[PDB]
Amino acid sequence: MYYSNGNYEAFADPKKPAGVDKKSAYIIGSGLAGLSTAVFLVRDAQMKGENIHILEELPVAGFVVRGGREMENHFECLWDMYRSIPSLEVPGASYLDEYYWLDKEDPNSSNCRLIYNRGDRLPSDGQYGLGKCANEIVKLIMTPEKEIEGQTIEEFFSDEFFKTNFWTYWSTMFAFEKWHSLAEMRRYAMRFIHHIDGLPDFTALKFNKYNQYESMVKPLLAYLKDHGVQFEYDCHVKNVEVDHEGDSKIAKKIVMTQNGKDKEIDLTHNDIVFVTNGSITESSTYGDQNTPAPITNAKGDSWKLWENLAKQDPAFGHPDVFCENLPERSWFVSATATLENKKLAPYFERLTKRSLYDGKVNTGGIITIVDSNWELSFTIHRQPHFKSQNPDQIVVWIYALYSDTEGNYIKKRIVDCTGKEIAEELLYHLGVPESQISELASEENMNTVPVYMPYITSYFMPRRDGDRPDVVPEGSINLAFIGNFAESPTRDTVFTTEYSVRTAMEAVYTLLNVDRGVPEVFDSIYDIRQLLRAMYYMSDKKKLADQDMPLPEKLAVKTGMRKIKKTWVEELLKEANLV
Amino acid sequence: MYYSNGNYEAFADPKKPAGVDKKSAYIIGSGLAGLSTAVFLVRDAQMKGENIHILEELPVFVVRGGREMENHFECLWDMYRSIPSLEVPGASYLDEYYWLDKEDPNSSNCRLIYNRGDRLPSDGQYGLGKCANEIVKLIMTPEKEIEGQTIEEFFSDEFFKTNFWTYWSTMFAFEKWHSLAEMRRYAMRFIHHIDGLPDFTALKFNKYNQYESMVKPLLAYLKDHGVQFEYDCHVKNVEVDHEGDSKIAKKIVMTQNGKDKEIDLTHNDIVFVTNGSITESSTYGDQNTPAPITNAKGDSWKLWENLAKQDPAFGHPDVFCENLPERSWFVSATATLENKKLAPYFERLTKRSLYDGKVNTGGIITIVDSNWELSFTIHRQPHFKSQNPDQIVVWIYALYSDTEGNYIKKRIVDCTGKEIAEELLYHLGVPESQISELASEENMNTVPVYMPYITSYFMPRRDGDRPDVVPEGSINLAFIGNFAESPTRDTVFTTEYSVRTAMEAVYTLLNVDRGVPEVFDSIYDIRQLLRAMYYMSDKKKLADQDMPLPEKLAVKTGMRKIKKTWVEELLKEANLV
Ligand SMILES: [K+]
Ligand SMILES: [K+]
Numbered sequence A: 001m002y003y004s005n006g007n008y009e010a011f012a013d014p015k016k017p018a019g020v021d022k023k024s025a026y027i028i029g030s031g032l033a034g035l036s037t038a039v040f041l042v043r044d045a046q047m048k049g050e051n052i053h054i055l056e057e058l059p060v061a062g063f064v065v066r067g068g069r070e071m072e073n074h075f076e077c078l079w080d081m082y083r084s085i086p087s088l089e090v091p092g093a094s095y096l097d098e099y100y101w102l103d104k105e106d107p108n109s110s111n112c113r114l115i116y117n118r119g120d121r122l123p124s125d126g127q128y129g130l131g132k133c134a135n136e137i138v139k140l141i142m143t144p145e146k147e148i149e150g151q152t153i154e155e156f157f158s159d160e161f162f163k164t165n166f167w168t169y170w171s172t173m174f175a176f177e178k179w180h181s182l183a184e185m186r187r188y189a190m191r192f193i194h195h196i197d198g199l200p201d202f203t204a205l206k207f208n209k210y211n212q213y214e215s216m217v218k219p220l221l222a223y224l225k226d227h228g229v230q231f232e233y234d235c236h237v238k239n240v241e242v243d244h245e246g247d248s249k250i251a252k253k254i255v256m257t258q259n260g261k262d263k264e265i266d267l268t269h270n271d272i273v274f275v276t277n278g279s280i281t282e283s284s285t286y287g288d289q290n291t292p293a294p295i296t297n298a299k300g301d302s303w304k305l306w307e308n309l310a311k312q313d314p315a316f317g318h319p320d321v322f323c324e325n326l327p328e329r330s331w332f333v334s335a336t337a338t339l340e341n342k343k344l345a346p347y348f349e350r351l352t353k354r355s356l357y358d359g360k361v362n363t364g365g366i367i368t369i370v371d372s373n374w375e376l377s378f379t380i381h382r383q384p385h386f387k388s389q390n391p392d393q394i395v396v397w398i399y400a401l402y403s404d405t406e407g408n409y410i411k412k413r414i415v416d417c418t419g420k421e422i423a424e425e426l427l428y429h430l431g432v433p434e435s436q437i438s439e440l441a442s443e444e445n446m447n448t449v450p451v452y453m454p455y456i457t458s459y460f461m462p463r464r465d466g467d468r469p470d471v472v473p474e475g476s477i478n479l480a481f482i483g484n485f486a487e488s489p490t491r492d493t494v495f496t497t498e499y500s501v502r503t504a505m506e507a508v509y510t511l512l513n514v515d516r517g518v519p520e521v522f523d524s525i526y527d528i529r530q531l532l533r534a535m536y537y538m539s540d541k542k543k544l545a546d547q548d549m550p551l552p553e554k555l556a557v558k559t560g561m562r563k564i565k566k567t568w569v570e571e572l573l574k575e576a577n578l579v
Numbered sequence B: 001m002y003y004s005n006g007n008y009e010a011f012a013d014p015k016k017p018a019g020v021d022k023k024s025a026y027i028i029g030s031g032l033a034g035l036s037t038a039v040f041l042v043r044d045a046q047m048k049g050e051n052i053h054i055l056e057e058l059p060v061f062v063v064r065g066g067r068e069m070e071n072h073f074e075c076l077w078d079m080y081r082s083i084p085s086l087e088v089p090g091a092s093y094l095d096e097y098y099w100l101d102k103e104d105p106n107s108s109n110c111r112l113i114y115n116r117g118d119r120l121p122s123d124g125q126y127g128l129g130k131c132a133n134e135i136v137k138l139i140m141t142p143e144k145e146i147e148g149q150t151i152e153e154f155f156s157d158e159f160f161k162t163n164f165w166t167y168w169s170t171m172f173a174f175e176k177w178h179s180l181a182e183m184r185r186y187a188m189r190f191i192h193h194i195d196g197l198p199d200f201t202a203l204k205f206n207k208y209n210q211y212e213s214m215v216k217p218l219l220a221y222l223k224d225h226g227v228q229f230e231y232d233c234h235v236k237n238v239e240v241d242h243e244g245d246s247k248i249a250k251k252i253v254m255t256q257n258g259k260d261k262e263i264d265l266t267h268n269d270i271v272f273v274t275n276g277s278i279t280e281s282s283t284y285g286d287q288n289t290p291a292p293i294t295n296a297k298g299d300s301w302k303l304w305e306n307l308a309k310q311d312p313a314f315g316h317p318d319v320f321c322e323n324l325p326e327r328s329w330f331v332s333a334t335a336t337l338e339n340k341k342l343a344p345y346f347e348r349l350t351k352r353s354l355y356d357g358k359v360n361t362g363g364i365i366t367i368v369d370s371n372w373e374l375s376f377t378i379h380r381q382p383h384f385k386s387q388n389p390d391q392i393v394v395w396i397y398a399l400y401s402d403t404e405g406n407y408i409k410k411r412i413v414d415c416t417g418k419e420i421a422e423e424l425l426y427h428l429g430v431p432e433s434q435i436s437e438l439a440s441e442e443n444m445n446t447v448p449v450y451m452p453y454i455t456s457y458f459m460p461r462r463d464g465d466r467p468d469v470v471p472e473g474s475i476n477l478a479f480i481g482n483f484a485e486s487p488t489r490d491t492v493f494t495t496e497y498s499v500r501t502a503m504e505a506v507y508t509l510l511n512v513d514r515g516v517p518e519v520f521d522s523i524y525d526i527r528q529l530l531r532a533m534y535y536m537s538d539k540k541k542l543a544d545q546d547m548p549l550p551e552k553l554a555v556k557t558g559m560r561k562i563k564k565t566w567v568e569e570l571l572k573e574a575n576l577v
């Protein structure tokens, strides 16, 4: 397998690799990584549809389970796949095309990113406000990853840094807690450096037409049905068994249980197994307008499988780190709130300076209430978010970064609230008069459903070498792990769909010997223009000479700019507006 | 119009732009730029095919010859993925090219020879020494600061004796009196290939000659979409108006079939002009006849002079087509081997059989002690589908045309095809007694061609000498080709440049809402800069590379400061530490 960039490798179709007609696929998990694996198998590997079996775990507005995240232009792998996938809303076009045109017609941006004081836009919204703390960020990048193994963000950054607007933007938009992986933070900093100009106003973000299920899953599924892939419902997989022959490792056996009966499968090498290991959606619970949701550390199929696998060889990772010992402080709860009327529309609309009812982008991503004890953020997508919605309905997404804090108005934790209470704390923070809050929040006017999720923060748990198992373990023969808990050999970032697609690609290309480049992670961090541009925007648009840095550094910079006068480097600096 | 990079914009299909049915296309020139312009109009602008008219200059073999490419011809690959192959049914041309490149990868086992068949001992070395710094000095020098400047005005005499200059000049056809700015552009553009210049591993080739592999699938695609080719067309001028600051094309005055003709045009008729030519006025010779020397300006150049007359922004053809030195490259010849008598000489050079259908010379071989700066190449065979199984076609070029050969005491421009072949056979180490018979028609047939403007793209230039692809205020007129000025830093004497001008022109004029890929950004990639300093110096660690003393001091100080950092990791990756 090899990595590449540029149009030549992107537009190129791979040759059918040797002996793929004698081979089959077992995809355990209908998670994005698994399905992606299947799509690549059909398209690039040219394995046959009737030979792909995706083993699902389930039998066949306000839907948290269907909700999904944003993307950006530089999800290279994901855009490769989706340019191969037929759209459902605009027949005859690829999903990528639908997405691309929608983004052009209804471009994402936020008119209000940070609020406080019960509904006032934060005066410094739009500013990073880093000061010398910017240098800290640079230092993090200058620090090799192996050197920060297991280390935490809180362990690296100053208190002053954590008071910056930059940290409010970063933590809330990416769900980075202070006790999370410093190495992963650093990866985000390098990876999305090209969007430093668009994080505060979210112009960097792009969104699907609808919730993740309608926009991202249904077109894939239709594509697969058209290609005769095999769907298995109500299946519950229990383990996979592996042998060691010299330095080689082979998957010999899979044990499991389906429908109402137990089953087993010995394996040919020509049967290929991909495990979408781990989950952040498992054990999700529901409440409603008048009911809350319950605390857990319960495990499940993915986690258990992964422990057995770790038992068999060290190379399968050390899983507990992701599903065990999550703080009460952790983000756990996410809720949906459906507005049945236009009674609460003005509060949001006053924030966004846009109408909720034109079908266009609204909050353009999350709005964070900075003086909220829960660190409450909320977002209203382009509507309808679900096609079921009636013309007057609006759907609002609510999340708390802190789950160990008493709210400002509802003195209970987010975890102890019904939908009505979360709605109530939000209404208080929107500047709804407290006398009106009870009638405005109730079902006649507002219908709110919460969900609790033990594992939503699991991806970002700090890690150590060998903690995450290589997508192809050294010596593996028909077994691969795919998804956001697998270790791609790239510097790519988890809690992204792009990572899932990348793992599927690397796994399929490696195992099935597909002779085509896998795109490297987009190389913005190595593009000097991007480095300069980032220094410009991170500093809130200050010329290099005016930026906050220690005095010897400032002098050194003055000397450097003196030396490079009338040079290509000076031109580069001019281009970045650093002089 | 906007520039972009990455897969998102690459894989995205543009919307049909507004009002593309009230507009028409007249493409002057059926060369790669024109055909590409037509392809983008059909595919992206979605102009209807019968509304596209390509005015060809020709009625219904060196001239067929074409250059190599590389992976980062971003626009060209964007085009050829849409074009069906003819050799590989059901696949795109890009697919054919890609698979071919994979099964028969290009490389050279012998780049430089001398002493009549001996491989140069330093083959594979750039051998730059301290001269390497000059190259850096050039990169670090803003283009505006070297406007109009010449290559020999910048570089030390020691630099010109380096192997690097031999490789560079012979592979790219850079003469010393050529554009320094263009050289700088080549250095930045192809920096990602510094690891693969001596052995030509950077190069990729079509299965066949340019007409067969590059042009024919295009023609089939275009006719298939019902584009209209109008033949025997000789455009003499295009008349344009000045309204306020605006420029508009009114009329094309042409002669077709010996008759003066005209087409007056609305603002909505769109005309693409391939200004200038490097192939025009080419003359032919054969085994027993030299090609006639000429200074004639054909249709293309006259058209460009007239256009320059009409508007100041329309460029200055005279800087490209006038006063070219006699030393300039002029002659290229094809030598068809009718049998296997001379085969061992080429085979001893390439360490490969000439008859396995696979790559041979893998690009040009330069004979360093030849007075002509004689280079020759043998592509993967057959190069023309016409060839019979015993035939092998050899391409011969001389960078110097004002010098007497070593065996044939004439300048190449005064030689028969047989004489050129004789000089080549001499340099291959054929015994002097055998040379006349071996060069003779029974064994070799060599056809020379004299091309007056083959070096014109590289003539030194100044801002405005080349007209902007869409000059400011134009509403229906665009210039395309390797004489047009793309607003990018892209490199001419490349097919990729032709494709780029076509894409930029169509996207700008017809308001196509999709990114045009920027020139591939290897020059801005730190991994590539580091890699370049590594390979350029013939694999020396940064401290060991030959450097002036203050500069060296700066480097030791720098390396000291960045010790144990991510930057040190990058330097490690580049093998600079
Ligand atoms: K790029
Ligand atoms: K060969």
Ligand code: NA
Pocket: A086, A087, A088, A089, A090, A095, A098, A215, A219
């Ligand atoms: Na769709």
